[PDB]
Design an enzyme around this catalytic site. Structure first.
Site, PDB file in Angstrom:
ATOM      1  N   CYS A 169     -22.285   8.541  48.062  1.00 38.21           N
ATOM      2  CA  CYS A 169     -21.766   7.512  48.948  1.00 38.21           C
ATOM      3  C   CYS A 169     -22.564   6.221  48.791  1.00 38.21           C
ATOM      4  O   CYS A 169     -23.559   6.159  48.065  1.00 38.21           O
ATOM      5  CB  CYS A 169     -21.804   7.997  50.395  1.00 38.21           C
ATOM      6  SG  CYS A 169     -23.481   8.234  51.010  1.00 38.21           S
ATOM      7  N   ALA A 193     -26.141   6.687  49.721  1.00 41.61           N
ATOM      8  CA  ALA A 193     -26.932   7.276  48.646  1.00 41.61           C
ATOM      9  C   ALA A 193     -27.294   6.234  47.595  1.00 41.61           C
ATOM     10  O   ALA A 193     -28.397   6.257  47.041  1.00 41.61           O
ATOM     11  CB  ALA A 193     -26.174   8.441  48.011  1.00 41.61           C
ATOM     12  N   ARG A 252     -35.190  12.301  44.701  1.00 41.96           N
ATOM     13  CA  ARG A 252     -34.849  11.476  43.549  1.00 41.96           C
ATOM     14  C   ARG A 252     -35.937  11.402  42.490  1.00 41.96           C
ATOM     15  O   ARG A 252     -35.620  11.208  41.314  1.00 41.96           O
ATOM     16  CB  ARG A 252     -34.515  10.053  44.006  1.00 41.96           C
ATOM     17  CG  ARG A 252     -34.043   9.131  42.902  1.00 41.96           C
ATOM     18  CD  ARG A 252     -32.889   8.294  43.375  1.00 41.96           C
ATOM     19  NE  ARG A 252     -32.515   7.291  42.389  1.00 41.96           N
ATOM     20  CZ  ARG A 252     -33.055   6.084  42.309  1.00 41.96           C
ATOM     21  NH1 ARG A 252     -34.021   5.706  43.127  1.00 41.96           N
ATOM     22  NH2 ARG A 252     -32.604   5.234  41.395  1.00 41.96           N
TER      23      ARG A 252
HETATM   24  S1  CLF Z   1     -21.003   9.602  53.466  1.00 36.78           S
HETATM   25 FE1  CLF Z   1     -23.189   9.025  53.109  1.00 36.78          FE
HETATM   26  S2  CLF Z   1     -24.248  11.011  53.372  1.00 36.78           S
HETATM   27 FE2  CLF Z   1     -22.260  11.248  54.452  1.00 36.78          FE
HETATM   28  S3  CLF Z   1     -22.640  10.837  56.867  1.00 36.78           S
HETATM   29 FE3  CLF Z   1     -21.814   9.026  55.550  1.00 36.78          FE
HETATM   30  S4  CLF Z   1     -23.683   7.785  54.997  1.00 36.78           S
HETATM   31 FE4  CLF Z   1     -24.275   9.961  55.401  1.00 36.78          FE
HETATM   32 FE5  CLF Z   1     -24.788  12.212  57.166  1.00 36.78          FE
HETATM   33  S5  CLF Z   1     -25.344  13.154  59.354  1.00 36.78           S
HETATM   34 FE6  CLF Z   1     -24.347  14.805  58.082  1.00 36.78          FE
HETATM   35  S6  CLF Z   1     -24.641  14.051  55.937  1.00 36.78           S
HETATM   36 FE7  CLF Z   1     -22.619  13.176  56.671  1.00 36.78          FE
HETATM   37  S7  CLF Z   1     -22.062  14.552  58.405  1.00 36.78           S
HETATM   38 FE8  CLF Z   1     -22.923  12.450  58.832  1.00 36.78          FE
END
Ligand code: CLF
Ligand code: ICS
Ligand code: CLF
Ligand SMILES: [Fe+3]
Ligand SMILES: [Fe+3]
EC number: 1.18.6.1
Lengths: 522, 475, 519, 480
Positions: free
Chosen positions: D62, D65, D96
């Site tokens: 995302c 990330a 990473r």
């Molecule tokens: S697309 Fe990216 S990793 Fe996803 S939430 Fe959004 S910024 Fe984060 Fe986060 S706490 Fe858990 S991992 Fe998600 S359901 Fe939300």
């Protein structure tokens, strides 16, 4: 001084300044110790190639041997039979050492008796000790069977075990029908694994040699398994578990895992489990006999081939991946039972872990020692893991074993930098790990002193010890582990890779110096 | 108590007639009013064959006990590989040194006898071995040849080899005929080792007065520094104003033993193992020797005052200073741990000294020793035990594996103190066990600092949660 | 060549050291090392700890994950089931990577890739396309739908979206699509597991209770919860088999998390069948292996299946494994076999053999509520003192139960239970009130680095028990439940003490006394 | 054996596309194509930077990330808040291997997880007050931090929080640089938009800090390494080569980077961009504003490293070019010994790659230096310009896959049958089960560095170690 809430054992107590001043005064005033500069210079000398040349030139002095004496192995073999009392004909000091040795490794009671031969028996023989000892042992501990081995004293004076036991039965000290197998186990021949082999052959010939007439090979449809000198409970368990998985009828002769792992439930069990006398008697009726550790079972193999007429396969120890495959396929061929999908899945899981951990183990250098079959299996598994066993040592192996090890190393690209040493002790190993440093040692608890020496030369010279083998005294419950089969290979693989990862974490824990590469993910 | 005699009778019925008649002599109730233990118990006899005796051998008592702790000396287990291997680093006789360079205690030097050495002798191999020791361990200050069983049976001559090699290398080489069959236990190993000390080491500086001597010179004899026991004892003696010139043999050196004939007083902790050398030094050098006990504050205070009475008033003044200084420490230990241990009953079975020496320490924690016995104690050992043990209390000499288990099943002690060979037997039965040989790898237990560890260890094991969980809840 | 150096030994070469020193001194504008040392010393004090424990908005190094991660693990426990997280794809990439690094195994999980367009119009089209694509491509028998925080914040209706997908023909009406709302701003990953399991159980049984009879199939349901040790699934099955107790392990991911490497990739392996879930109300009872994280499932099973669900602790240590076995025996009527009594006795024998090295040892531990409670209970049974008990997920009810457990034992008198605290709180605790060891996941390695930096005598070694374990290999295969799990924990604990003691006594001529061969 | 023809590659592409539903198949058909070296514009063969199809096992991350995990997180002297629920910061914590030097928790915070740990009250009533209080606690408990970044997770942009206002007020109050980054994970289609958002955050909040500051002494050989994230020390192996050439690396970000280095970047003479995809935004801005030229360089393998070093040296005077030939000559025996040792054991091996936005094309020269051939490659989030650069660096009729799905990548591997696969952790254990050697092209399989001459020795050792490992010959049970 002791604080009631900070009571210090020896290690932190004597590091207090008052004890440090006392020890310094004692050293400087009365000990007449060599100057520390001279001590440091000599230690540096003992880590060099010139010292190693002198170290390997010695022919009379043995320093820190990695082996025991024959009657110790005979005691372990005797403990593998049901309600059997290990009986060492000879001096009582040996039995006290045998029991203590096994006490510290298994953390378990070890039953073994001596007939307490003394200076009188040094000139007249131990016949009276044998008659009294067999009668007393049977009356007091009520065994179903008394397995007789010898201390070096009885062997040197040439006591006849057969005649002594026969005279004990003729004069009524023990019943004529009471099973008293015997084996001469001279401690100046071979090692403890030789004593196990001699004891098993003595028990096997006691129950079967004079009863071969009605025996028929394969009539009971089972497979005999002779483990040899084995101090891992999981090795007895993994073999039985794999045979049950294949639905292969088997007889584990000299099975001591029950008596070496009795529960703590308010009762003491001197005897537990073990191979029954009926199992030993019916052993010639098996389809075949498998030597789990063929290099230490040559006398048993000769007897089984020549007397039982069993075509004993040329099987390696079932260690690692290839040799566990060969063991399973040999069992499948003899019994006609297919290898189940569960064992294929277990093999695949071991292969998966080998794939997962291969990056951290490839190229890792190991110095290893132990008994011949365990060392050969460990070396074979290390080659399968892409590791380089650069110092392979076996204090109690012959030249035939060294030839086979060289062939195994020649078959692998990872054995090119490997040297096999036979008849060498752990002082030889200490020189080897200094001059040609491995990343790790695989061996018993005596290797801890080698690690202390290598650390003293420097942190970058320290060779950590991975405790696999016998005896293990400074760790607890490692005797419960497994080294055989896929399960044993998984345990060894997990131990090896996490030893690398733990050592790497120790090297990279230094904040702002090596804390880069202190990776969360490895 | 007739009840204890009834117990002795019941355990005796298992034995055959010959074995039983022998064993009745070695079991008896304690009579404190009795002056000579020969009239109640018999000791230092041969072990019955075919019984699980706990005893070791003369090699264990000489190599393991007396000579091995000497750190700057290399000790050869002369014979097959077994004896040196099983005794390697098994006793916890603590030392300070660089192992493999100038200290060799946890090392296993052996001649590793093969068939050729048994058949043709090992005298040439021993001579070659000593040369290799000189080459590879040049900083050793002496060599001892501990004979294993075959050495005395094949007719080897290690005295001749030791004499020739000692002159050749300018070294002290001590031949010890401690063949494991020679006696009935480790006890004869002590006597053989003590005679080896007298004949080869003790008289080294007889015509040498260069060492500076004071009026407060003492030597600790028969303390083997088990977990630092002798270090905990030494700090008390030196805080009293005494100079500990030597200690035998834990953390000891060959030069310390050679300096012993120059001390004013020989403090013997283990009478059994070292009374031989103490009597010789009294008859030859005129050095008085006295027994002392540093187990528990009560014994430690009594011994410190008794030692200080052998010197001038300045030492006695410093003795009361040391006793006062450590009084809050052990009183806090008693206040913390005696409530958790008061009334508990202990059965002990150790070698020649500890069955009686540790009793006062247990009594300092409110505990009672309801039974004790020696593997190899002599009649004089049992003479000393008679007054240190309660009336009508079980005593067992050279107790067998069966007898000790049967006694425990009836007496039902809250704690058992014995060796490693019975540790795991009584842990199955659910009785807390403390090793009285290795201190269960804890310690030291000597002196005031050792009493805190001792009380902590007794409390830790006796009151451990594991002992309340041996019965399955569904059973 | 012949000495190819990876990063750690390579950058310790003098040329790299000189480069890094120049870079720091000329461009980095770094704080002086004296100030850095002074601040680090300050962060190890009680004054810093008081400020550290006063924060209410900042979380530093938490010891928890978010709900959909637990939902994915629960979904992986069902046969041929594809975990499906309705929401943004970045979450699924993190979930898969997180489980990839712990299990060293492939982790199957799909997202419907909700983007800025779905932030306004909703994720209905993503659900319709995603369910159709997932079924057509990976051919699962079942798609278990959870949610990312984005889908929860915008209020997407999972039930309506899945119903519309079936009505418009994107998936067959009969295709099982259980769903659970798993908001990451509520609870933790173990909450997501509980919600996902309750959603799957509700999907298969809520509307089919009419023909169900309690105890008609003669089995016992086992709900493990969020479990990342393969041996824990194995030990429960093994113990039930040797008791000859018919059981149904619902959400069994053991096979799919341990597939063999034999030249073939298995996306699906094992798992609880849909018939097993459908027949679950017919069981005699249901046992929650981790009751503290299974409250929603427990409420559903008690109220819908009418199962009693006994108040059982996690089967950890000796006492609670005894209680679990006796409760199984009572429900099924099957006696506890002598093999299990022998295994219990062997665990007791090891407890006796190792008690001297474990008595009085101080431990700081963290992890999930049930594992922490079981670890604390076993530590008290071993005579150990867990002085810092931390759980980022637990509530005040859990803290009350833990305080009662500690009050029952004299070895819990010096114990403090922390809830809602992270591993930066733990770092202060191990500095100000130092334990001998910490039991925790791989994130504790940074705490050990900090305590070592203060000094070797201050270093608190980490014993890796829990989730996640990233810097060791194959530890996920081990067991923490039952007598076998207690034996493995005991062996790890006592040998951690012995290995640490050997490290402290290895110094030649300084601490090499007490470097004992025998321990 | 000849490589797969173009016709066979298209035929394989058609077969993998059959199982897709019609809407999904039409979309995926544009993201798979044989390689055309004669093609100038990759738009006419492959399509990239589009939305991921729902319900497929995409490897993409995302925007959070790509911003927190990639660009901002490696900055060591700054504290980066994962603003939102606990999950995002936890999964990206120390995952990473952006290497750095510092005292973690005191003046360095890379492997740390600072988060606001949103609860439902913060979702319902907003987290602006929580963010303001959180920044105060950061100042109290981590006083040596040199800056703060607020990395927004998905709910931040959905509940209407205003982190720019909080960052501005708190930065003025504490005299600290606070960078609000609107990197909500739903914003884009991959980590690629996270790079653009993070780059804009650098531009708007950090890069201008010293525009009126001229105190820093400058030389004619000042360079900045842009888009090297020091994976296993990659930027350190690159920096030693550049400074051996006589250049002064004033700034390197984000790997081992500081906020002050970022602020010193507008003062360099040349911007060396290793990852064009993640940092071309800031490079173009610096050229347009400060007039600093930027050039792409590749330190993967000796051939690319030598070409890049000579090309960098050509941007300076003859003294730098002379020192470049000294560096190339000095390291020539080292990498030639590496090739002589490992090329015989790797020659002819075929590798398929799939990494995010740079490495699918940047590591190809290193493989070709070892005698290996890259028979397939693809990007998670590479743009059209990324695929433009790949066309010439890639063999003819070679499979290219943009945003490859879990099914597609497996089916491609089953047919192509590569000797080695280089991809992420989410594909490592899939192909190891199939018996194909796998090397992580993201974390370097926790080995490395691979950049520069010192990194090439590790790279060749790692490729040989995995490809020729004995474990791969034992996948089949002997009785089967
Ligand atoms: S697309 Fe990216 S990793 Fe996803 S939430 Fe959004 S910024 Fe984060 Fe986060 S706490 Fe858990 S991992 Fe998600 S359901 Fe939300
Ligand atoms: S020497 Fe003797 S058996 Fe006096 S052989 Fe033995 S270290 Fe015992 S009761 Mo082990 S006569 Fe010492 C002894 Fe006592 S080894 Fe130690 S504890 S005080
Ligand atoms: S009573 Fe004592 S310990 Fe026994 S032998 Fe004799 S000196 Fe020695 Fe030695 S090698 Fe083995 S352990 Fe013996 S059988 Fe011989
Ligand atoms: Fe035990
Ligand atoms: Fe795996």
């Amino acid at each position: 001084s002791q604080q009631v809430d900070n009571i210090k054992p020896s290690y932190p107590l004597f590091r207090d300044q008052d004890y440090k001043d006392m020890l310094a005064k004692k050293r400087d005033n009365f000990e007449e110790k060599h100057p520390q500069e001279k001590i440091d210079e000599v230690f540096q000398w003992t880590t060099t190639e010139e010292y190693q040349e002198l170290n390997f030139q010695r022919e009379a002095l043995t320093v820190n041997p990695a082996k025991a004496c024959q009657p110790l192995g005979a005691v372990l073999c005797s403990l593998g039979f049901e309600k059997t009392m290990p009986y060492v004909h000879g001096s009582q000091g040996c039995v006290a050492y045998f029991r203590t040795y096994f006490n510290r490794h298994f953390k378990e009671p070890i039953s073994c008796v001596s007939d307490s031969m003394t200076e009188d028996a040094a000139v007249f023989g131990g016949q009276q000790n044998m008659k009294d000892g067999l009668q007393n042992c049977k009356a007091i501990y009520k065994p179903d069977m008394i397995a007789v081995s010898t201390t070096c004293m009885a062997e040197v004076i040439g006591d006849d075990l057969n005649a002594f036991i026969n005279n004990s039965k003729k004069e009524g000290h023990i019943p004529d029908e009471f099973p008293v197998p015997f084996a001469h186990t001279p401690s100046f021949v071979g090692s403890h694994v030789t004593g196990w082999d001699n004891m098993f052959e003595g028990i096997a010939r006691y129950f079967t040699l004079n009863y071969m007439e009605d025996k028929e090979v394969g009539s009971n449809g089972k497979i005999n398994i002779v483990p040899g000198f084995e101090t891992y409970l999981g090795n007895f368990r993994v073999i039985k578990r794999m045979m049950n998985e294949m639905n292969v009828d088997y007889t584990l002769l000299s099975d001591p895992e029950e008596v070496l792992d009795t529960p703590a439930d308010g009762q003491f069990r001197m005897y537990a489990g073990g191979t029954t006398q009926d199992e030993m008697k019916d052993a010639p009726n098996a389809l075949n006999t498998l030597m789990l550790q063929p290099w230490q079972l040559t006398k048993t193999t000769k007897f089984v081939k020549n007397t039982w007429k069993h075509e004993v396969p040329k099987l390696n120890i079932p260690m690692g991946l290839d040799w566990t495959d060969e063991f399973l396929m040999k069992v499948s061929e003899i019994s006609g039972q297919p290898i189940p999908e569960s064992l294929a899945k277990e093999r695949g899981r071991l292969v998966d872990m080998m794939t997962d951990s291969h990056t951290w183990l490839h190229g890792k250098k190991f110095a290893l020692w132990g008994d011949p079959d365990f060392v050969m299996g460990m070396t074979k598994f290390l080659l399968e893991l892409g590791c380089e066993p650069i110092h392979i040592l076996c204090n109690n192996a012959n030249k035939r074993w060294k030839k086979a090890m060289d062939a195994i190393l020649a078959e692998s690209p990872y054995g090119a930098n490997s040297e096999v040493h036979i008849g060498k002790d752990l002082w030889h190993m200490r020189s080897l790990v200094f001059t040609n440093k491995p990343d790790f040692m695989i061996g018993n608890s005596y290797g801890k002193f080698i690690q202390r020496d290598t650390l003293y030369k420097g942190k970058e010279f320290e060779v950590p010890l991975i405790r696999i083998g016998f005896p293990i005294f400074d760790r607890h419950h490692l005797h419960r582990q497994t080294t055989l089969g896929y399960e044993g290979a998984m345990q060894i693989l997990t131990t090896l890779v996490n030893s690398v990862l733990e050592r790497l974490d120790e090297e990279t824990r230094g904040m702002q110096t090596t804390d880069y590469n202190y990776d969360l993910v490895r | 108590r007739d009840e204890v005699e009834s117990l002795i009778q019941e355990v005796l019925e298992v034995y055959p007639e010959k074995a039983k008649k022998n064993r009745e002599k070695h079991l008896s109730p304690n009579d404190p009013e009795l002056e000579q233990s020969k009239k109640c118990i018999t000791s230092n006899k041969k072990s019955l064959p075919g019984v699980m005796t706990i005893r070791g051998c003369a090699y264990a008592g000489s190599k393991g006990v007396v000579w091995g702790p000497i750190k700057d000396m290399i000790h050869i287990s002369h014979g097959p590989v077994g004896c040196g291997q099983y005794s390697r680093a098994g006793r916890r006789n603590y030392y300070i040194g660089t192992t493999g360079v100038n200290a060799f205690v946890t090392m296993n030097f052996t001649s590793d006898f093969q068939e050729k050495d048994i058949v043709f002798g090992g005298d040439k191999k021993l001579a070659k071995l000593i040369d290799e020791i000189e080459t590879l361990f040049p900083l050793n200050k002496g060599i001892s040849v501990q004979s294993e069983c075959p050495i005395g049976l094949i007719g080897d001559d290690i005295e001749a080899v030791s004499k020739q090699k000692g002159k050749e290398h300018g070294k002290t080489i001590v031949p010890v005929r401690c063949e494991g069959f020679r006696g009935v236990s480790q006890s004869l190993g002590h006597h053989i080792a003590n005679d080896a000390v007298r004949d080869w080491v003790l008289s080294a500086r007889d015509d040498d007065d260069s060492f500076e001597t004071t009026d407060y010179d003492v030597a600790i004899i028969g303390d083997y520094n088990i977990g630092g026991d002798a270090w905990s004892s030494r700090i008390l003696l030196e805080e009293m104003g005494l100079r500990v010139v030597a200690q035998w043999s834990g953390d000891g050196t060959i030069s310390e033993m050679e300096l012993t004939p120059k001390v004013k007083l020989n403090l013997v902790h283990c009478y059994r193992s070292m009374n031989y050398i103490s009597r010789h030094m009294e008859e030859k050098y005129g050095i008085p020797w006295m027994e002392y006990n540093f187990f528990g504050p009560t014994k430690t205070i009594e011994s410190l005052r008794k030692i200080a009475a052998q010197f001038d008033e300045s030492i006695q003044k410093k003795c009361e200073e040391v006793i006062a200084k450590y009084q809050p420490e052990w009183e806090a230990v008693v206040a913390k741990y005696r409530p958790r241990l008061e009334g508990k009953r202990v059965m002990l079975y150790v070698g020649g000294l500890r069955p009686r020496h540790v009793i006062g320490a247990y009594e300092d924690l409110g505990m009672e020793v309801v039974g004790t016995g020696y593997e190899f104690g002599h009649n004089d050992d049992y003479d000393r035990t008679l007054k240190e043990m309660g009336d009508s209390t079980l005593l067992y000499d050279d107790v067998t594996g069966y007898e000790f288990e049967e006694f425990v099943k009836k007496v039902k002690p809250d704690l058992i103190g014995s060796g490693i060979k019975e540790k795991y037997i009584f842990q199955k039965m659910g009785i807390p066990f403390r090793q009285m040989h290795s201190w269960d790898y804890s310690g030291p237990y000597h002196g005031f600092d050792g009493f805190a560890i001792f009380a902590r260890d007794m409390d830790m094991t006796l009151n451990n949660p594991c002992w309340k969980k041996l019965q399955a809840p569904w059973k």
